Amino acid sequence: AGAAPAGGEVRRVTMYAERLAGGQMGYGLEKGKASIPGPLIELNEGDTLHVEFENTMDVPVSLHVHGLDYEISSDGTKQNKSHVEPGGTRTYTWRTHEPGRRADGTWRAGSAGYWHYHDHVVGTEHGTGGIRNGLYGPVIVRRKGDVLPDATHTIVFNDATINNRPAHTGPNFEATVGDRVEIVMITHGEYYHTFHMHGHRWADNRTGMLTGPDDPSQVIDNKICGPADSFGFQIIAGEGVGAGAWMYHCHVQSHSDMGMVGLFLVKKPDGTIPGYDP
Amino acid sequence: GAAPAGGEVRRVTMYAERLAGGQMGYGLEKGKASIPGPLIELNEGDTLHVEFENTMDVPVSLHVHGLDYEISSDGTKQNKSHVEPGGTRTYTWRTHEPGRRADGTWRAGSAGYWHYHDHVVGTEHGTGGIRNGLYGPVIVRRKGDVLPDATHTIVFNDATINNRPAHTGPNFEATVGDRVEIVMITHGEYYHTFHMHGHRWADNRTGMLTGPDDPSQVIDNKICGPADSFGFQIIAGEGVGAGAWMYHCHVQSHSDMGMVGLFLVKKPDGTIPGYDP
Amino acid sequence: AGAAPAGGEVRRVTMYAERLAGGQMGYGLEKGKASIPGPLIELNEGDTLHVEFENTMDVPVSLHVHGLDYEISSDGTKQNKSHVEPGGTRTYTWRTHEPGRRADGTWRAGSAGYWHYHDHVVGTEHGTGGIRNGLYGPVIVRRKGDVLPDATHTIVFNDATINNRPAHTGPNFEATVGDRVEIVMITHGEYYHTFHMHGHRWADNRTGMLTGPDDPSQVIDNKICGPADSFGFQIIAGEGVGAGAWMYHCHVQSHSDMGMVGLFLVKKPDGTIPGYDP
Ligand SMILES: [Cu+2]
Ligand SMILES: [Cu+2]
Ligand SMILES: [Cu+2]
Ligand SMILES: [Cu+2]
Ligand SMILES: [Cu+2]
Ligand SMILES: [Cu+2]
Ligand SMILES: [Cu+2]
Ligand SMILES: [Cu+2]
Ligand SMILES: [Cu+2]
Ligand SMILES: [Cu+2]
Ligand code: NA
């Protein structure tokens, strides 16, 4: 696979907050193309991102990001008046940094990780309405040399839904046996959850992959998460287990019974999935 | 002692059976089902063929966490890998050692504290079967892992421990200095926090720090949710001595309602100072 | 910055349990000086601490500690008769130890970490009433060479309150940009929470700081916690982000909405906070 390069680029992108059907709200990079979850933003440590933001809605909205470097003017809260008025525009700036030794000998942690952005002002001063309506999305910051995946899928447990979809409607994600598949897992709202994936497992650390034989991180296939938690991992699709419709679901029993389930559809090279009859 | 390299093909018979009071359990022999079900121990590289029989009048399945299995041993109705009433099926579990892939990455091995449970009784996620007692622990050891003097399994199933009536333990006994392994599994609807008085462990794969370079937090209290599993080994009474050492869920209403038990640590002469039930 | 020395001192302190206003109860080091959270106790690995304890209330109380070494006679439970009757006195003894290789060849974990003490007998035999009333406090055990902070702040999520405070009353904590600030985070009661801090992040490990480039711990700014969980970390105030009123809060949406929120007030050297009014 590929490997992430050293960062240091200054990038710019447009983002819009838009109303969607059914009282929903989403972010998008192009006007009229908002989505829930919002678009995946990927940066290498050291990169700067200027987000030229426009609120197309009739209510104030904001952009608050986890983990990355931002000044108080990009906090995205009413507290420091860094929200965006209806119809207004604003440049949010996110920075990231590499890890390194401070002059005093301590080690500064870098920005790399699985992160997310979301609204902080719709409905309440903590964005309860905006988050419920769909204003959230994933952010990945990569360290130089991190392994790059063939595909990235984002799964958000928001209240009792996955990605604000109606119960029992996935999402499903497709891969071929051997694909290096990255999962970004974000939780929002009111409830705790446990994320479980059949047939696969990952390391409970920054990258979801063990660094080598000396990494003592627990290897897991089930993880408890609460509102605004984010983690991610990579798996080799079907590794040691073969093709199939591999369930993922919240493992809180009533949540899985009510439709917080989806399928990791791992196909053979001929594109078929043994035993899978929809 | 230490765990050997795995690679054996092992076989075991397992039965799902009704127990008293609407409960259900797994067992290795007919009539000896238990809650939790039997402890299954493997070394990385071992294969296990579970020759499974459903003795009940409703369908049941066997779904395992962590281990390698093909979709035909998923243990779900969706993949048609459940067991009809009176039926039999061989579930196959495989395990593997860690190793460097061709692309240069490190493949994580199977070693860890895992568990198996039903996936079809009551609902297509086994909500009824899990509630009824259809769960059990699996340990997969890596070559060189330290072996314990005893292993005890503690399952927080909804507001119960091991499906026992409230305020009824279970209790476990050890002597000061014993190396005691705890397997901790959670099931059902609720989050919990597992706490043990007088003892502590490392929040990592084995529950023990690998040495002075391991940065894992050392804890005596751990949040867990449905289908979480973890485990650890402690030295009974290490630095604290003999006594009736409580363990309990630390969610206050849960400990109040009876999610509590005792780790009875005896001196070599058998005495437990001040213990008076 | 400073570094913790090797421990091994026999230390002594008096502690009192007292009623406070409005049905609350607290621990203090001197009579009339009980606080919620109770006083911060700091030890170096190897130190022994003798707590000369006195119950000044009209109901039995106890003192139970997490993480530290104690004999069964200092368990602090009525079950073992290590509670304190009204007006009674008792000496609770806590010990700590350095890590080291056992005779059996395995590595014995040291006492170092972020811990806490609390009541175990008020209301119920698990201290539900006493904890609810305010009988809890932080304990920090440092390892030789641990980095010492400029200030330490304790944040306890107790049911749906912070430090038993009325909703929407903080607490707030002040620092200057560049300060090395230590946060002790304890959870009590009935609910799970997720602790989030704007503008800052830490490592999910013992110290909250990565040991160096080989530490694979996830770097986070959001962490799920349940009753009797404790963790801590150090941050450099405003590092890479600047001065400002930086929010911290539980991220469970109804909890933040109903006032489990405070401010990390990071000042410029002149003492001002950009974008914030008192
Ligand atoms: Cu916030
Ligand atoms: Cu859920
Ligand atoms: Cu599973
Ligand atoms: Cu947030
Ligand atoms: Cu499942
Ligand atoms: Cu519980
Ligand atoms: Cu499961
Ligand atoms: Cu207790
Ligand atoms: Cu909360
Ligand atoms: Cu406690
Ligand atoms: Na870890």
Author numbering:
A (entry chain A), C (entry chain B): 40 to 317
B (entry chain C): 41 to 317
Provide the authors' original text about this structure.
Substrate oxidation occurs near the Cu1 ion (named T1 center), and electrons are then transferred via the Cys-His pathway to the Cu2 and Cu3α-Cu3β (TNC), where the reduction of oxygen to water takes place.
Met199Gly and Met199Ala mutations led to a shift of pHopt for 2.6-DMP oxidation by 1.0 point, while Tyr230Ala mutation shifted the pHopt by 0.5 points. At the same time, Met199Ala mutation influenced the Topt of ABTS oxidation, likely due to increased substrate dissociation from the SBP at high temperature.
